[PDB]
Design a protein around this ligand. Structure first.
Ligand SMILES: [Mg+2]
Ligand SMILES: [Zn+2]
Ligand SMILES: [Zn+2]
Lengths: 49, 199, 78, 50, 107, 50, 209
């Protein structure tokens, strides 16, 4: 969620993404943006795609 | 009236700062979106996301802008030579003359490891060594010093002292600094340009 | 023969350290005697200093070929 | 280490110097305007009189 | 410059339908055949002629006398003047010097 | 930052890989010179110069 | 006047023949330092000079490898070249049995002939320019680096060195003024030697597309 009235969670904006790209750290922004935001598991059919 | 004119002039800066929040941010957004994919490969090339060649060698030299000591050059030969002279005084060894300096420099640089270095860098080192070897000659001539080292007021040998150990140390330091100042493979060489122009 | 530079680039250092730290976090034998440290990353740093990390780098070239380098034969510097 | 009003109060000779400079500058400006309004002013060869 | 018919008060036109031209209306039959001169116009309009002689055009305009710079004074810039807009407005002059790597040119 | 009421965020990476990458590539000690032209940024500040 | 037209004629002759020499065709050195007074010596004044013929040149041949290969240079006179004129040049061309030709127009040339100038024949190709462009040789310009066209062996060795497929190189447009100057066709690679701010040099290559 977004606010402080509700419990929050700070934002990794569109500029921090470019900073982390600039550092060249490839696993750290993966951990920041998928592992600890909305890592979800699905199932896909390869026959139909 | 002065108070009113002063406030009138002042508010322009506030308005300018308020406006500035948009244009530079948008320009940096576009630029970083455009330049994001470029990377430095193991062939010393830089290639796009599809393997297309953008450059055959990064920036011509292949050197890292952040490791530059001089004005866009990796060294200032005078500064390194002075540091090596100061930290490694040679109280026992004899001062070199022009011919001996040239001979020993040529002998040291002849080794294979220096041939592995970049050619233009060797040209620069030769130029600087020739320059200092020419400078020492004027000083030795003006005071009438003998290269045999037998002059009686020995303080005259303090004017432009340089000894083989100092030459070796200077050359090794120059080469080492040059080798470690390169742009490493894998570098995000595209985003750095975008940030460095946008900021 | 091998053409790529003999220095270990900072990216190789980062990923080798991270992978070895993750290996040590899971129950894995530690090569070098440990004084009593309890943080896996420090143990990985000591393993790198002693040059005992059992990892091999594979430098992939854009044309498809590759070169294998052992962690103990790169020039680890400051 | 401190800063006070004594550190920013103007000196004596500064007042005389500023007075003289102000008078000289104002007089020079008045002569330039006098030269213009009668047409005597020489046009600098980069722009018109204004 | 314009004329109006005294008979009805409208702009007239010129036309030829007989041995001599005439100043004629079109809503009323007023005709005034012209037989003398008039000495004023509408001041026509054609655009800025800039490069019709650009560069080094016909060298017939070689001239001897020229001014000199207040600073440097090498032998190459003879003098020039030109014009501003139209018939009855002043004519401007600029004095311009050019060797390389600057931006000097006076008015 | 200037300590006039400013605020700053903080993140705690949740992995050994992320920890290592952050420490080695983003460490403060490894970033003493700005990459625009290689000039230092972290140096003394006012009242340490005086 | 009557000197400035001849001045232009002399300059365009100099530039076109420099281009011919750089392309490698046969040319004589003594003609390279031709002076404007020399041009007046070898050709009369403007009233005595007929534009459509007084500058025609075809002596140049590919002596470097095939002296039998000859080149045509034609100089129309009318401001815009018509279809009948280009037909005249093409029929004279067929009479002389050459493969390629070159045209220099004063101001332009009609859209019908614009279209025609691309589909006369696969075996024949014609080169078109303007006087304004040829009044100065861009290869002597300050900004332009040195372009060198290179043979098939050299390009093969190049793309064997860096391990490329030929379509990964940077591209130079077929219509680029320097490409037109060297007349190179699609599928060719040009070395460029960029002068560094120091004594050093950078080398890059571009592929015509
Ligand atoms: Mg603040
Ligand atoms: Zn399915
Ligand atoms: Zn009427």
């Amino acid at each position: 969620t977004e606010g402080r009235s509700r419990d929050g969670g700070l934002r990794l904006g569109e500029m921090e993404r470019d900073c982390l790209i600039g550092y060249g750290a490839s696993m750290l922004l993966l951990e920041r943006l998928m592992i600890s935001s909305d890592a979800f598991e699905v199932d896909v059919c390869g026959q139909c795609g | 009236t002065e108070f009113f004119f002063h406030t009138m002039a002042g508010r322009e800066g506030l308005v300018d700062t308020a406006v500035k929040t948009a244009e530079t941010g948008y320009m940096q957004r576009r630029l970083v979106k455009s330049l994001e994919d470029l990377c430095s490969q193991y062939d010393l090339t830089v290639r796009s996301s599809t393997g297309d060649i953008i450059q055959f060698i990064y920036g011509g030299d292949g050197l890292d802008p952040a490791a530059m000591e001089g004005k866009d050059e990796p060294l200032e030969f005078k500064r390194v030579l002075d540091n090596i002279k100061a930290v490694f005084p040679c109280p026992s060894e004899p001062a070199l003359s022009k011919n001996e300096l040239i001979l020993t420099t040529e002998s040291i640089m002849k080794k294979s490891e220096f041939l592995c270095c970049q050619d233009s860098f060797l040209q620069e080192i030769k130029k600087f060594i020739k320059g200092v070897s020419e400078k020492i000659k004027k000083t030795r001539d003006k005071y009438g010093i003998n290269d045999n080292g037998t002059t009686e007021p020995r303080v005259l040998y303090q004017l432009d002292r340089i000894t083989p150990t100092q030459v070796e140390k200077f050359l090794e330091t120059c080469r080492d600094k040059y080798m470690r100042a390169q742009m490493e493979p894998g570098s995000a060489v595209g985003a750095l340009c975008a940030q460095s122009i946008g900021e | 023969k091998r053409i790529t530079t003999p220095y270990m680039t900072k990216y190789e250092r980062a990923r080798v350290l991270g992978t070895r730290a993750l290996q040590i976090a899971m129950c894995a034998p530690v090569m070098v005697e440990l004084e009593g440290e309890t943080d896996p990353l420090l143990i990985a740093m000591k393993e790198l200093k002693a040059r005992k990390i059992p990892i091999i780098i594979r430098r992939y070239l854009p044309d498809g070929s590759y070169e294998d380098w052992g962690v103990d034969e790169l020039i680890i510097t400051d | 280490f401190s800063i006070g009003i004594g550190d920013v109060t103007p000196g004596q000779g500064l007042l005389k110097a500023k007075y003289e400079l102000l008078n000289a500058g104002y007089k020079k400006c008045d002569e330039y305007i006098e030269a213009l309004n009668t047409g005597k002013l020489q046009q600098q060869p980069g722009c018109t009189a204004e | 410059m314009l004329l109006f018919c005294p008979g009805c008060g409208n702009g007239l036109i010129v036309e030829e339908g007989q041995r001599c031209h005439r100043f004629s209306c079109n809503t009323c039959p007023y005709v005034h055949n012209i037989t003398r001169k008039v000495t004023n116009r509408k001041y026509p309009k054609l655009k800025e002629v800039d490069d019709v002689l650009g560069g080094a055009a016909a060298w017939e305009n070689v001239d001897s006398t020229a001014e000199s710079c207040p600073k440097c004074e090498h032998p190459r810039a003879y003098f020039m003047q030109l014009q501003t807009r139209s018939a009855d407005e002043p004519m401007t002059t600029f004095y311009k010097c050019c060797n390389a790597q600057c931006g000097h040119r006076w008015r | 930052a200037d300590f006039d009421g400013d605020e700053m965020n903080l993140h705690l990476p949740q992995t050994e890989e992320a920890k290592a990458e952050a420490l080695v590539l983003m460490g403060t000690k490894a970033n003493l010179v700005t990459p625009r032209n290689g000039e230092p940024l972290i140096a003394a500040i006012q009242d340490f110069l005086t | 006047d009557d000197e400035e037209e001849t001045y232009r004629l002399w300059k365009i002759r100099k530039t076109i023949m420099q281009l011919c020499h750089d392309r490698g065709y046969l040319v004589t050195q003594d003609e390279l330092d031709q002076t404007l007074e020399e041009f007046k010596a070898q050709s009369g004044d403007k009233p005595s000079e007929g534009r459509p013929r007084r500058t025609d040149l075809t002596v140049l041949v590919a002596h470097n490898d095939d002296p039998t290969d000859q080149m045509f240079v034609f100089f129309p006179e009318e401001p815009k070249v018509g279809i009948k004129t280009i037909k005249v040049y093409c029929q004279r061309m067929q009479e002389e049995n050459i493969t390629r030709a070159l045209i220099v127009v004063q101001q332009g040339m009609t859209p019908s002939a614009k279209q025609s100038l691309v589909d006369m024949a696969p075996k024949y190709i014609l080169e078109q320019f303007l006087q304004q462009e040829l009044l100065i040789n861009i290869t002597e310009h300050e900004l332009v680096p040195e372009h060198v066209v290179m043979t098939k062996e050299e390009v093969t060795e190049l793309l064997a060195r860096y391990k490329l497929r030929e379509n990964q190189l940077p591209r130079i447009q077929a219509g680029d003024p320097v490409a037109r100057y060297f007349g190179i066709k699609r599928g060719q690679v040009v070395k460029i030697i960029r002068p560094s701010e120091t004594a050093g040099r950078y080398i890059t290559y571009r592929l015509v597309q």
